[PDB]
Structure formats: C-alpha cells, structure tokens
Design a protein around this ligand. Sequence first.
Ligand SMILES: [Zn+2]
Lengths: 53, 287, 341, 330, 198
Amino acid sequence: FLEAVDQNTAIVGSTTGSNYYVRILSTIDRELLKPNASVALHKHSNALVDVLP
Amino acid sequence: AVDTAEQVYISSLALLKMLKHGRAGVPMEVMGLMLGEFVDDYTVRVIDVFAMPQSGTGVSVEAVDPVFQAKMLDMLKQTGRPEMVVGWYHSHPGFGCWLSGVDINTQQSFEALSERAVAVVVDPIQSVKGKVVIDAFRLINANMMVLGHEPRQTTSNLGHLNKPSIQALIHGLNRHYYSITINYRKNELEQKMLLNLHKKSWMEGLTLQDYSEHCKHNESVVKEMLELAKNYNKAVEEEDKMTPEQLAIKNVGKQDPKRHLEEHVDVLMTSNIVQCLAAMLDTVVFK
Amino acid sequence: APPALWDLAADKQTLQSEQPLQVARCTKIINADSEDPKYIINVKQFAKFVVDLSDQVAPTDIEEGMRVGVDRNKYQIHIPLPPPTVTMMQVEEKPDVTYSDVGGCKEQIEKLREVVETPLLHPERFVNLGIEPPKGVLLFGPPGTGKTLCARAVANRTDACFIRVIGSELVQKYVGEGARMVRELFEMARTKKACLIFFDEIDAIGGGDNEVQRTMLELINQLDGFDPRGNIKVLMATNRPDTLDPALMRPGRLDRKIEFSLPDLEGRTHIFKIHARSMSVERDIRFELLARLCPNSTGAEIRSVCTEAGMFAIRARRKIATEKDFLEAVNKVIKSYAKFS
Amino acid sequence: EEERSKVDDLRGTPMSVGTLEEIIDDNHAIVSTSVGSEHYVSILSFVDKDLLEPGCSVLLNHKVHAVIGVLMDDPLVTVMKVEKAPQETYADIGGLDNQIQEIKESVELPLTHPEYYEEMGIKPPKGVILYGPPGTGKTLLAKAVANQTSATFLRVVGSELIQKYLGDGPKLVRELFRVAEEHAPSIVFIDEIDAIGTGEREIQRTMLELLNQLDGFDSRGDVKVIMATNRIETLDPALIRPGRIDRKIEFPLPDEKTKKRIFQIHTSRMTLADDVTLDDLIMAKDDLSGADIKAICTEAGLMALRERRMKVTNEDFKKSKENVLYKKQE
Amino acid sequence: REELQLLQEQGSYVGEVVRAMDKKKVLVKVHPEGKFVVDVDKNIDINDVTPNCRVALRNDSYTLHKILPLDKQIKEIKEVIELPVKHPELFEALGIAQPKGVLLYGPPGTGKTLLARAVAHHTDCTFIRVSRMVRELFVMAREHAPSIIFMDEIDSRLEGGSGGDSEVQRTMLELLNQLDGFEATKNIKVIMATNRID
Ligand SMILES: [Zn+2]
C-alpha cells in the first residue's frame, strides 16, 4: 500500500513496482487503510481481504 | 439478403463437456466440434459435444483430420446420434476470448457448409468460480459494411447480451466481429435427477449417519468453539463498555464501520445448533 | 494535410493489405546453424529461440548473424532485408597526388612501383614468368611526409582510385563492430572484382586490449586467410614498431619492409611541379630556387609552406603569387618553426 | 470528412509513444521502445517521412503498430544560434585591425569576393581557430561578429549541451551538420570549448568523433568552421592536425590600453561628465572582460537614468565601478 | 457484483500527466513500457486536468477518473505579548503605533523558550518556531499568520555566504515590509533574538 486518496478508494503498489488504482471493498473498515501496511490483493480480482502483520 | 434473430440453445451436455474440456483446457491450443440439428432459421440446438486430440500446430484447418472427423461422426451415425455438426469450439487462455486471424480464417473456411457456424470460446483459466458466464461468437459478412451491421430484430435480449461489457474486447474489436445471445433449457428429468443428485451430493448415505456425530460433538469439540465464541463476545463487550461514552457525548454521525450486531446474531445462530440438535438427541434416545 | 489527402484516399487498400506483412518478431538475429532444418536464433531480449526455415527463403541466402524479418505467430522467416555509418563513411573515391611526388627514393620507388603498377598492368606476365605477382611493400618508421605516397598509390592506379582504410576508426564504443566491418569491406572487396584495399594506421589497432585483440587477431585471420584474396595488396603504415603481433604474423603473407624518411634536392622541385597546379605561381618563380633554398623540407612540410604561404598570399590582396612576397612566409614557417623543432 | 474521421480507430485507445530508429526505402520503417521492439508496417497518412529526422520519438499503438501519425517535440536547439543581424561591424573596434583582418580575410574570401579564392584553386574549407583569454563572448563574439554583418550565422556556446544529458553521442553534431548542410552559406562558431576540461570516458570519444565529423571526410567545401576556446592547454594535441590546419593567432594582454579601447567603445554612445577620469578606471581593473564593464554601463545608465538624466557623473560611475571591484574579488 | 467485472478488469493503472495537447489527445506518462497517449473519457473535461500531476487511469480503456494529490522582564514584556491577549479586535481602533517586534540580546539562560511559551501559554495561541528549507516554513507562517514566531536556530565584508545569508536578511526585510507594510490580520507580533556581531 502506498497512499489513500479518498474514502472507499485508494492506490496500491504491486510487487513489480507498478502502482495500481483499485477501489477497496466496503466490508473492510478504515483500520486496514494504514499507509505503510502489507496489503494483499487477489491474483485476478485484485481485491484485498486482509493485511499481513 | 435477409436476416433474423437467432438464439443458441445450450443444454447441460455441451456445458459440462466444456467444463471437463475447460479442466483439460491447458495453455496449448485445443479443438472441439459441436453437433445438433437445424429445425428452422432462427433457432439452433446443440446436443452432442466431444473433444479433439491436441497438436503442436494448435487451432488450424490442417489439424482437423477429415478421416478422423468423418470416422467419429460415422461411429456416431451407427449409434443413436443422428445429428450433423453445427460448429467448432476451442479455448483462448490468457490473451482474451477474442479470435485471431487464423481463427477467423478457419472459421471462414468452416462456414462454407453451415450458414450459421456457431463458435464458442470457453476460458475458465482467469474466470472466477463465482460465474461461468460463457458467450457465443458469430462471423459477419464483409459485404454488409455499406448497409447496417446487424439487422437483428427483437432488440430486447441485447440487454442480456450487454453483460459482457469489457471496455476493450467487445467494442475494442467489435468491428467485423459480433456475438449472439445464449439461453438454457432444462426438462423435469434433469431438474429432479440433477436436483436430487446435488441435494444428495450435500446429504449423507442413509441421511442419519452424520447427525449424531455433531449431536455428540456438541459436548466434545463444539464446547471449544463455544468458549472461543464467548471469548469473541467478551472481546467485543470490552469495547461495548466504552461505546456508551461516545454515544453519551456525540450522538451525531457514525465513524466506526463495525456494526457489532450482525456478528453476534451469527454467533447466536451457531449457538442454536445445541438447541436444534437437543431434540435430535431426544429422538435418538426416545426411539 | 494536402499530402495526407491522396494517401488518405489511398488508405482503403491498406485494410486488405494489413493482413499480410504484419509479421514482426523484433528482427531477431541468428547465431549459427548446427543443421539445415533447425536454426539457433537469439532475440535482443536475451532469449535464445529455435525455429525451422520457411519455404519462402532459400537456405543459401542465410548468413551468420544476419538481421532478417521473422514471424511472431508461425515463428518462420517470411522475408529477409538488406540492412555502422563509419563503414560507408570511410568510402573514398577522389583523385589526389600522382606519381610526380617521388621522394628521392630511387630504389624504393621501384620496389613499390613494381608491385603497385606492374601486377595490374601485366597479370599474365607474373603468372607465366613466375608463380604469382608479388604481395606488397611496408612503409613505416618516421612520419615525415607520410600519407603522400598513399595518395600516390591511390592516383597511381590507371583504372579507378581505390578505397583506403585508416585504423583510428576501430577504437570506439560498443566493441565488436570490427568483425562485421572487415568482413563486409572484404565482402565488398570480393564484389569489386579483386580491387586493392589500403590499411592505414595499424598502430591504432595494434600494440585491457583483448577487445582490440579480437579485431586485430581476426584481422590477421582475414589477411592470412586467402578467402577474400591472398594476392592483391598488403601494406601497413605505422609510426612505431611497437606492434609485435603484426610484426610476428606479417612474415606469413606480408613482405618487403622498406623506409621513406625524406626526399632529396631534386625531389622538392617535383613536389613544386605537382604544386604547379596549386595556387597560381608566376612563371618568374623558379621551382629549383625555392626548392634549394630550404633544407629538411619534406613534402608535408613544404605542403605547409604552400598552406601558410597560400594564406599570406591571400592576405596580400594580389592577383598572383610572387616568390618575393611569400618567401618570408617560407623561411618563417620553416625557420621560426625549426627553432623549437 | 468521413475518410478523415475514420482512421480514429488506430489512434484511439490502443495508442503508444515509441522511438523510431530509421526509415527504410521499402516503405516499412523500424521503431523501438524501452525494450526495443522492432515492427515494420507500411506507412500511412499524416506523416512527412522527409523532415521527420529519424532517431526521435514517434507514435505507436497496441496493435500491429501501423504508423498512424507523428508527434514533434527540443528547446535546446533554439538557444544554439542567433538569427538576427547585429549592427556591430568590423569597423567598430580598433587596435587589432590586423588581428581582425586576418580572420576577415581568412573566412570572408570564400563564398564572398571569390576572384582571390576560386582562381587560385586551393579551397581550404577549415577556417581559423582562435582563443580569447578574457572570452565571455565579448572578445570571441567581437571577432566573430565581423561575419555576422551580412551572412547567415551558426553559434555553439559551451560543451554543456553534450554533458547535460545521457551519452546520446554525436547525433547533435549530425544535426548541426545537416542544418549546416542545408545552410551552407554560414559560419560555424564553437564557443566555450571545455569538453575535457569539465561518463568522462565517453567525452573523449565523442570529442574525437567530433574531430572526425568536423574534418569533413565525405563533404566538399560547404562551410567555414571557426572554433573558439579559453585555455589553449585544455585541448589535446590530437585535436590540432585534423582541426586547426589554416592559421591561428594570439591575443594580447588587456591591461590598460585594450581596456581603454573597450572602455571607449562601451562609452562612445553614452554621455559622461567632464570630471570622469580614465586612469582610475583603467587602474582599478585587473583581468576583466567586457561583460562586467557593459553591466556597469547598463546599471550606470539606468542608475543615472533614475534622475531622468542621461549624463553619467563621476561619483555614480565610481559607485557602479565598486561592482567591478567587488565582483572579480568575490 | 456489478463491480465484480471491474475486479475482473485486473485493476487499473496510476496515470501521471506531464503535458496536455490541444488536439484533445492528452499524453500520460505511465509505468515503463507505457507512455500511452489517449483521449480521456467524455464525461470528464480536458482543461481541468492539469499537467505534472498524478491521475487515475484504467489499464484497458485508458480513461481518466479524477485528479490525485524574571519579574522585570515580564513587566516589560506585558506590553508586547500580554497586549494582544484580551483585546485582539480593537487593534484598528488603537492608534498608538504598537511595535512590530522586540529583540532580546544576552546570554539565553531563561527567556528564549520558557518566557515565550509561558506568556504565550497564557495567550492560549499557537506557537510557531523556526527550528534551503528556510522558505517553506515562511509560507507556513503566511498560512497560519496569528502566532508567536521566535528565532532560535539562526541565533548562533560581503561574500556569497552573506548573499545566502542575505536571503534570510531579505526574509526579515520583507517581514518588516509585511508587518510594517500592511496588517493583513490582527495579532501579528514576533520576537527577535540575536547575540553576536549580527
Ligand atoms: Zn494463443
């Protein structure tokens, strides 16, 4: 995760270095919106379910 | 110069054969042939669908062996399968379901006999297991560029044809390449045989075996899930002790996306298994 | 837009012509060939590929390390294509100094004249009278008036001035171009019906340096190797004998090492005789006088005498040049420069 | 109209920006990108193919890369040369009349007044190479300005244009050689030659390649190249014989009299008071060019112009002279 | 589930526009092997998209979505700091020419931080400190004008170092040109600090 630009939508940096713009899912609260966090999207859906400690 | 509103009938035969063929849908190009019967102009029904052996060349007109095709078709003619071929299908993994120049060339060569020439491309590789939405493809005439593209009546089903609304492939390559709607059909034998077969696929053999397993596991294993369930309940109540302060201060607006209600409702639903199975133990003990 | 109008109307057939010629696999170049069916190819992305040859390209038209068009769908070679700038930049066809500039070397000018003039004029006399015409000579040592006999050799050919090659063009960035350079200029030497090729400044490619050892040892493999030709011409020009590898590999094919230091009293008047077609010299000026009034005046030094003296003759605003007007430029340019040197 | 608005499918969403390498006479050119993808497709409309000057950025697509058009893009080329005709002639400066008639006679004889140039049959199309100890464009542009009266001019100042970017190579020298080819009646002026004085290994090979292309091995007499540096010791001895082959001269030390003449020329149009002495002005200076005395003539004319007067008093010109005394000592 | 097709879109890229073109075809600098010039979607105007900024661009349609980002010392200082405490509004009515700033030269034992933060702690106003990186804090002081600004880090022949220092001398000269220039807002009072040849 790189930055959060607004509510319910943010940007996420992929492993290859390219930054991705993906709307986050509504079920996830604002606790997972930490700027320096280990976010994990899906391999196809590219949606985040939970972050890793 | 005439056109109608055609619709491809898809039963569970071709569907499940495209699902096993999708499991065998390796990155290597695969080949298949669809069969059926043409009853009128604007309807097409598929019944028989089989697979073809793979080749190093892949999808091509040279890979289609006419003596093997006609041999298997003749072996279907000596059996109870008096249906002629209606089209050919394949898989396009990774690069999208669109058709390359070779595919449109072998489609142009294979459409000389059948005017319809139904084409279906299955791609279960990147498609999630939630939806199995599949689409059938068609070939447009090159001489129709002056007149309207598709003079197809009954424009109601186009709303159902607008579900594949990818912003690159459909209208990214829609020129000289359109599609057609897909509907299904299910008789009572498939409905009751497959319905009872799936309910039984989620049920037991005698249907009385694994009931007492959980009825008596409520005392051994579920007790741990009940203690942990109470640990989550108290783990939320420790914050619910702090909630009446904020609710006693602001009372305006909601900032916490957590509801703290439906999760506890679900905990009660998992806790009601003891109540629902207590009567089961009462029946097993009674008679 | 006016240029795009007729081509815009001519863009209709580009749709029916877009299906062909679409093949482009980044023009991957091959490396070698173990067998005729399978060809080992390497793309620029550091990915080695192998594919069979198509039916549209003959196997005899395949060259080692040749950039050709290749499909990205069938991976076959549809059509080849003919295509550094220094190679064609180094092409030289210009008239220059003739034989009249013999620098006093009575015997040496025959030792090289019998190999630069006679083998071309008498091909049968040297094959029947002997076993083959001579190889060539070797001008080296002190620079002095160097490169004058090179132009003398270029204009000395009675048919067409040939190509000369300097050696200071091989030491550049992206080493390895020397191989293809010498192989394509020797291939063009095969195309020019056994033409003669001159190689100047061997000291700029001889004497880490292993990337240069590739180009100069391969150069020796192309000189001693009689594949282009082993009879036309061999000649190297260097300032120092500190190039030991060409000195130990030269006895195989090169021969007749000679010297050319300075001309004599009767030569400088002949360089003035070739300067009779230079800036206008009045008939009152005697070539023997100006030639005898300057010792140690090699053809390059007196070429600079005519250069600086030409500049002062231009600055004099005169219709013609007179010896009394530029003799100060002569003895100034030889004596004021001879003081420290 | 429809044929003009029908090619929008190629320039639509599947569009990219690539880098063309060269144009082939077979109407299929070769392009490149970050990974160097080479695709050859028959050309289309909206392209020029003549003034395109291959080796720049072009327009590509996500498709088979049919070239639908081109997109031009270099601000550094504009600041290279001046296209105006300054009124400063060879008769506006004195003392070096021979030093200016050597270059005037050197490069004004070709292509102008040709009876003393083409009748001789020499044609040394190399030109002289000078150097000014003060430099700063004042002396070297005061000597090169003689050719700027009635002629096309070409100016190159500083070796920064090679070192301010990645090692593209001598391609910019090829651009100056093609604009000089299309502008043959011109004068090439290279100023502030500090390539080796200021990777470093590539500067030597692009400088020796600059010497190679500057020698004119394939071109006839086309243009006169006049180079101008500041220190003659910075240039290697290898840049001489293939470089300066016509003539060179030396510039005297501007201590008192050359600064008196520079002061007279910089104070000939302006009006100064009677009490303005010269010995203190030519005494307080020490190894100064003309750009700072022109700067104090400008700020002295403006500072004296603050009182709506054009006369420059002595105390105000000493007050502006303090900028000269401080600037060289800072 | 309608958004699930946009999940199947394999996400979207992050576009960065560097130059706008007048032909309604804006080039956008993207990830390497990018640089995809394309016309933006029809529901979003072109002129609003400013160059040199990052935007949201889809990976297939290439459409833009939106823009992205001591009792005597206190007795003598009461007139300097305790004056704007109780009556900040009637400064326009007061015509006694209140001083712009005050200086305190000497050994900074007590009075550099405890006095300014103590009396300013009685003022209950924000206390901005200085702590080239010397102009952005001045822009922050321009944004948050009402405060007590105090020099603490700077308190420690002409030359280039006196020109670079003369940039901050120019900063305080334009502090006398803003403070002594025109009162943009009430309560603008600062405190100087200097102990050496300066
Ligand atoms: Zn494929």
